[PDB]
Design an enzyme around this catalytic site. Sequence first.
Site, short mmCIF file in Angstrom:
data_model
loop_
_atom_site.label_atom_id
_atom_site.label_comp_id
_atom_site.label_asym_id
_atom_site.label_seq_id
_atom_site.Cartn_x
_atom_site.Cartn_y
_atom_site.Cartn_z
N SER A 1 104.62 58.78 -61.78
CA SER A 1 103.71 58.32 -62.41
C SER A 1 102.91 57.29 -61.23
O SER A 1 103.67 56.64 -60.11
CB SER A 1 104.15 57.07 -63.51
OG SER A 1 104.91 57.95 -64.43
N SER B 1 109.88 61.80 -61.19
CA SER B 1 109.81 60.75 -62.11
C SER B 1 108.99 61.19 -63.67
O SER B 1 109.39 62.56 -64.03
CB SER B 1 108.89 59.77 -61.62
OG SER B 1 108.90 58.53 -62.19
N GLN B 2 107.73 60.96 -63.89
CA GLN B 2 107.17 61.57 -65.06
C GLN B 2 106.75 63.02 -64.70
O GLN B 2 106.81 63.99 -65.78
CB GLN B 2 105.78 60.82 -65.41
CG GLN B 2 104.98 61.48 -66.57
CD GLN B 2 104.02 60.88 -66.93
OE1 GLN B 2 102.79 61.43 -67.55
NE2 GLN B 2 103.57 59.68 -66.51
N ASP C 1 119.37 54.53 -60.52
CA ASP C 1 118.30 54.70 -60.86
C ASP C 1 118.03 54.85 -62.46
O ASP C 1 118.71 55.78 -62.91
CB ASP C 1 117.75 56.17 -60.38
CG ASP C 1 116.17 56.58 -60.88
OD1 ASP C 1 115.80 55.74 -61.56
OD2 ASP C 1 115.79 57.46 -60.41
N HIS D 1 115.01 54.25 -57.66
CA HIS D 1 114.10 55.27 -58.06
C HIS D 1 113.14 55.56 -57.12
O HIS D 1 112.37 56.71 -57.13
CB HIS D 1 113.09 54.64 -59.30
CG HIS D 1 112.43 55.79 -60.24
ND1 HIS D 1 113.00 56.90 -60.53
CD2 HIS D 1 111.13 55.81 -60.24
CE1 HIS D 1 111.93 57.65 -61.31
NE2 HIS D 1 110.90 56.98 -60.94
#
Length: 197
Positions: A26, A104-105, A159, A172
């Site tokens: 993201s 991530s995303q 995370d 993260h």
Amino acid sequence: RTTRDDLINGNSASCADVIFIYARGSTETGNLGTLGPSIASNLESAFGKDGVWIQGVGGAYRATLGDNALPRGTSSAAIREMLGLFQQANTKCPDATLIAGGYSQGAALAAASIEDLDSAIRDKIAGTVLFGYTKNLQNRGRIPNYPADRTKVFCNTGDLVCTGSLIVAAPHLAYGPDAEGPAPEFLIEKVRAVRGS
């Protein structure tokens, strides 16, 4: 810098042996973000610049913060984009081994795309690496419809997105060393296992 479109630009008369499709996190730039470029130089060192095509997921994948809240952790338009790239890879280069990854995303996107993918093309994906996988707890560390032995999840202690939340904490942002070392080594090993030698 952070954009590679080797599959979209590649000539099918001179297919690479390996095609890597990667979805950024993201907010990240280009279509590879922070981690993609590191994985790509390692794969290029292993297979040769002409032996591997690097393709980031661009187009409709905007990598918006809001889309993390959607059912599968990303948008239907982004899943369609990544599905279209796997389909394009198989159409242009049916003999190429595929490998995939996401952060991530982008890790939720890779998992959703592979879940929905035609099983015949899914079988050609030798390995997938996921960093800061936002659906790690929900999916019990797995990509739906994809075998455990082809999956490698990198989820740091602390995370929180790996433990069912969406809060971004400092662990993260600490996947750089993994993307340049163990993640490309895993992918290279899985390519050699399906291709043989």
